[PDB]
Design a protein around this ligand. Structure first.
Ligand SMILES: *[Se]c1ccccc1C(=O)Nc1ccc(N)cc1
Length: 283
């Protein structure tokens, strides 16, 4: 838990015009290019889950890379929502794609000397697919994307239902407010599997971790663990196979037999990809 004391970690307040509020960002300056560490489904408003559960700041200190941990956005999928969550009285509309691709990099460039292009997006759970989608649509900003235990095919089959249940359990957020009914084009637009041809076209460097065991982030107490584990395995296998079948050749896949969907294995991946990121972003 957390990193050693004494690191140059700043707690910034970054204005978001689109969301009508300041967004807290934990930041460690260390070079013009940065790793964006996105949080999981249960993202809190006090600290990013990477800081709470791992020594990420410590592990990337003097890496030649800046580290950016945005704080907040529980169940947001770091996306621009159609409207406020109608199930829990959310009093604004999540605009986290706008924040991550416009407002925050503009501010960090002007105030901290961080380049808006040539960065890495690293997500887990909910933000695993987010990281890939950001790379798909903003390749100049993110030539590198890592997805750790992400939702890789959110528009397909039972996934919109399962994601809806998880979002509801994580703070009462409503998936229909986010991307609409499952037939809405927003679901496929934000589906990494569907957007594989974009990742291939951009030659995005992707790093994909698949875990074993029950995805604790949610099944929903109705749903058998075996059912969810089976679906997760098949979806991941389909993603890897489809990436290759579509001409993808810039993807690192990690499926250790012992790996679980947990912070220790997600941190092990973050450490494992450090030299990879240093090479892609800094040469
Ligand atoms: Se990530 C994954 C999910 C389901 C099945 C297989 C995988 C996978 O990545 N397998 C794999 C095989 C060989 C090498 N060198 C890396 C990864």
């Amino acid at each position: 838990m957390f990193s050693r004391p004494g690191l140059p970690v700043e707690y910034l307040q970054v204005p978001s015009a689109s969301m009508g509020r300041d967004i807290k960002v934990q930041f460690q300056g260390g070079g013009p290019h940065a790793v964006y560490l996105l949080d999981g489904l249960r993202a809190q408003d006090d600290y990013n889950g990477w800081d709470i559960n791992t020594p990420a700041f410590e592990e990337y200190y003097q890496s030649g890379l800046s580290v950016i941990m945005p704080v907040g956005g529980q169940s947001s999928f770091y996306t621009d929502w159609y409207q406020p969550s109608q199930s829990n009285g959310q009093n604004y509309t999540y605009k986290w794609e706008t924040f991550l691709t416009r407002e925050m990099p503009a501010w960090l460039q002007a105030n901290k000397g961080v380049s808006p292009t040539g960065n890495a997006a690293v997500g887990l759970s909910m933000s695993g697919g987010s990281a890939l989608i950001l790379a798909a649509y903003y390749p100049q900003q993110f030539p590198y994307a890592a997805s750790l235990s992400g939702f890789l095919n959110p528009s397909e089959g039972w996934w919109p239902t399962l994601i809806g249940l998880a979002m509801n359990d994580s703070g009462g957020y409503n998936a229909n407010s986010m991307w609409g009914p499952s037939s809405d084009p927003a679901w496929k637009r934000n589906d990494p599997m569907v957007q594989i041809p974009r990742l291939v076209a951009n030659n995005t460097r992707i790093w994909v971790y698949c875990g074993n065991g029950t995805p604790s982030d949610l099944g929903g107490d109705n749903i058998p663990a075996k059912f969810l584990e089976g679906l997760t395995l098949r979806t991941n296998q389909t993603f890897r196979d489809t990436y290759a079948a579509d001409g993808g050749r810039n993807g690192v896949f990690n499926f250790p037999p012992n790996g679980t969907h947990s912070w220790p294995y997600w941190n092990e991946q973050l450490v494992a990809m450090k030299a990879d990121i240093q090479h892609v972003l800094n040469g």
